[PDB]
Amino acid sequence: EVETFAFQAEIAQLMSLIINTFYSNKEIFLRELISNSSDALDKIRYESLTDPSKLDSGKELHINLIPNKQDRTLTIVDTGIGMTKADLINNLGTIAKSGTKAFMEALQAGADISMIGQFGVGFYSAYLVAEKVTVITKHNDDEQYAWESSAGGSFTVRTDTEPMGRGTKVILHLKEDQTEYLEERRIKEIVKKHSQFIGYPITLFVE
């Protein structure tokens, strides 16, 4: 069973803005996604402070960056809190409707697209480089789900049958002209430029 949902109008407009606005500095997508993974790791860590069982689904708190040139995908994996089905549907646990508004009003008063993260919607920056994003996620309180969207106003959710234990994988199916983000040295440069001080180990996988 694949369920198809309409994005809320503001989210669709946000995504359409991210996709069609000329904006060369695309590399910030990776900072935003790593920061999202970092927040999710903080969240499961905080919960585990008072209930260690919350880590039964996996004790290690990390972020993996996985490029795959043959699939043309870059995958960001964390072992953070993950998302329930309800979270996914509800704009992947973001306040995306009011976030989009504040971001818009910010763009008005001279904000840059690189500030998208300050408004709780940095996830959608994935669309600077990806023609399609697939999000596989497992929260302690729910089954494993796959969310997917090539934008154009709709997304799908289905149950996902390779278990990951707990966390979220963001699979970026890159646009054909953005394969530089599969390059080890390019990924290293960006992680060093924008994610130097993240508090969890970031492992860049080799091909």
Add this chain to the structure above:
Amino acid sequence: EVETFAFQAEIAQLMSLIINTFYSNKEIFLRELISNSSDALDKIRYESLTDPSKLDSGKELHINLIPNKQDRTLTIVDTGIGMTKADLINNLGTIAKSGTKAFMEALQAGADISMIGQFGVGFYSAYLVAEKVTVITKHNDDEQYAWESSAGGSFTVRTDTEPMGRGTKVILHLKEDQTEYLEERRIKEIVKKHSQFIGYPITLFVE
């Protein structure tokens, strides 16, 4: 009944570092606290998306900055998620132990104290300007509590008997040489410099 608690050793060391390190750019405290209030507002907003009753305790989502020259206090008030007694005790809902470590290791690789917020412990930057901080908070799931600390290794928690509905008030009892932060024009400059794009209205109260 006033209960007195010892800070965890790392938090005490963090606070001692914030208090004793020479660092002129103290104004960042206000950005960090407003950002904390912003995160707390996002949190109650996200919860209300699926359970509007969560806003029975107050529909308006805002931040107030209240200077009081006669008390020598600057108070940051939000109507965000607030904190339970357990949250307060557990380092005001922060991952302060692992946050402090990452911040330390960041200070090692050439981080600045202004980056404290990236590590989930920007609250403690209050101690750049305050000799004492009192935190009054009300979470939907608990009573209203007052947390207090002049640092020196301990904090107190007690039940608080002026109801606020829902949210958190951070009362900064300013050091005697930091009263510039009670000045309307100084507060305006800082809010404009560092908090321009916050997604909730910030009201600077007049005396």
